[PDB]
Protein: Nucleoprotein
Amino acid sequence: QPDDIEYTSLTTAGLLYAYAVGSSADLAQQFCVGDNKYTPDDTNAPP
Amino acid sequence: SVTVKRIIDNTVIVPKLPANEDPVEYPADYFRKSKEIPLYINTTKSLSDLRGYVYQGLKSGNVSIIHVNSYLYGALKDIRGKLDKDWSSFGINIGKAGDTIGIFDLVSLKALDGVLPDGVSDASRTSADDKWLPLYLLGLYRVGRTQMPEYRKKLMDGLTNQCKMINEQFEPLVPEGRDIFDVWGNDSNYTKIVAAVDMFFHMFKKHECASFRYGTIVSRFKDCAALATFGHLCKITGMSTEDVTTWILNREVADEMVQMMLPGQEIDKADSYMPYLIDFGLSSKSPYSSVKNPAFHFWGQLTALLLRSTRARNARQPDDIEYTSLTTAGLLYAYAVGSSADLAQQFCVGDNKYTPDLTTNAPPQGRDVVEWLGWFEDQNRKPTPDMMQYAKRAVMSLQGLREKTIGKYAKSEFDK
Amino acid sequence: SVTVKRIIDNTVIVPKLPANEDPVEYPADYFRKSKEIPLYINTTKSLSDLRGYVYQGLKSGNVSIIHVNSYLYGALKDIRGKLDKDWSSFGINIGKAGDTIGIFDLVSLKALDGVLPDGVSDASRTSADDKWLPLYLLGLYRVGRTQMPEYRKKLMDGLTNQCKMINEQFEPLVPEGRDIFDVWGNDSNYTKIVAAVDMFFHMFKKHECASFRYGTIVSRFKDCAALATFGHLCKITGMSTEDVTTWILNREVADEMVQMMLPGQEIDKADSYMPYLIDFGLSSKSPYSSVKNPAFHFWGQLTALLLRSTRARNARQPDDIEYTSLTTAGLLYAYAVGSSADLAQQFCVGDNKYTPTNAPPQGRDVVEWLGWFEDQNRKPTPDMMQYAKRAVMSLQGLREKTIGKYAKSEFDK
Structure:
């Protein structure tokens, strides 16, 4: 843990990035047999 | 990839990072170059002098690896074994209709001369020989693999398998951790004898001397764990090989699964060279290793753990993979398989149950990827508290978890 | 073999995985080839010299297995035993109306000559012999099977069964773990004498010398546990063999049950060769083993455990089976049998009792119960989950890797 950096803002930013990547997984079908899933159908809820 | 520009001053930046390499090497794409496997046993000097050099050289840390290879060759050219069918692999014909073949029908050459002790050595020993001395030398190859104290746990394998119509006792002295006999691993020519033995007795599974496998077996599928974990995943979920494949849900696992399934390699073959791709020196980076298949290794082992596997409890957690998305995908697949059981009547007495006669948030009825993927979109692509609870029950109440296992990862992540 | 294609770039991938083999070998499909069982006792040299070679060779780790076989042969050709009915198995006629037969009426040949110590050996010993020396040699075959310290637990079996009109004491020295006499297992010809003895005294169950079974018995149904667990499941649930069969609810258990029931094998037969399929060398992979019947083994043992079995507490948990679905099915079966008891008046004195949504079926019928399970979302009800907890909580002394430890860890929260 380096000295003389800006710990609080550096960690808030880390939290956000890790939380973004963290909750919304990649996740997409990769192989099929003529039968696949086209996904794209359909405030405080995250992106 | 594209163009990244720095906003404050609108300048280009070209993000790049250090190169990485060692590509895997497939077995087939090697019988393209050569068409034989060289076994260098240079020195050939008295099948009976050798018996002694080793017999004594073994009660002290200094027996030449060059001497065992030479002894082994000599005590093993039992030209035994008769082919009922035909045997062929990678173009190399190793015997046909009816022939007899011996272990070393896998390509003998010889070389240089920096030999150890003189002429007619410690000539005390008789034809104890074949009966057991080779089985011991080969035995140690295995005891040399294992790091933990499981080693002496498995060196009693040796003792009690020797007593089979011959009975002596111990031999060496110094522990292990790779020092004494467990350096034999690195001798390109020692491993080759091991592979040849194991491959040969995997064909004539019923030979009288086939007991030799009893230390030569850890050669088969050495450095090919990804394949095994795949087979385990299939057995543990009851799914077919082609259905498991469809439940792969991440770019890098799919990349790796394609890697392992490349078509010219005889993986599904009966008795081929491919299991021994590493010890015959056909490959120096196995495409089937869990080190070269990290994402698939994590996903496959994590999934099997949630589905109640015991092996998965101790598998190793690779570095530099995408843990969060890899585990979300594992959770889904294990939850699918996990809640909707197979379950169908199998036998009857003229009286059977024809089955096919909770709305939206209730999960699919089978184990199909598309149904389940769709149900997951529906749920905000975030795990429902039930499947989160399902995971908790499977990992809570495990114990004895070693540091850095996919087991400890799983408990720490799910058992709050 | 349908078609898997990779969506991102629409290419074909051909999922395949390493081959596996060793098919089982049935007993019947072996008397198709040969029609006899070779017992090689090559050396035949003095029924009385041999008595000594072994008597001494036994107070030290070096007696030749070739010498015991030869001695055993010689001390055991008591041609005793008279058939009341007929005896016949697999086409092989081994005796008919009235005959007398001996143990070795199961096919003697001889061979090579790498013999040990000379001519007229340690000739101290008399006709102690038959009376007890063979019963001891055969005894050790059994003591050689067991791994744990249960071995000496069972070697006192030997001592106290010898004292029966002869009384001596110990003999060897070195422990076991497979080293001394427990290497005798591997001698194709030793096991064959064991099987022949046990099979012969399972017919003349009342012979004076039938006490020999008292170490030769672990040969019978060696490597055939699936059959025994089946019988146990039947006894433990009170159901018939045909009814238990209908409660099989998973592809792989049904596959395996079909495997064990293949019709030309004499499993249900009185005195056949089939129990000894392994030790007579009729088979080198038993179709009836629990290793070759893992799904059935788990399901059957787990179910018997929930119904209160004690054997089931220590059975081994096979790898590479489908644990979750296998246990859900077990839960259901054990819960059905478990809550609705048989229970019917059995005796009377002119005075008897003619008996006749989310509440479960009234009997033990698969269809009623399968339907009730559909009704419940194909997920176990909290009552049956609680039923399972009561049966496994309060067990103790559970060894690692038993279907017992699996069951407590899975149900006793």
Notes: Residues 36-218 of chain C form a domain with the Rhabdovirus nucleoprotein-like fold fold (CATH 1.10.3570.10). The two ends of chain C are 42 Å apart (CA to CA).
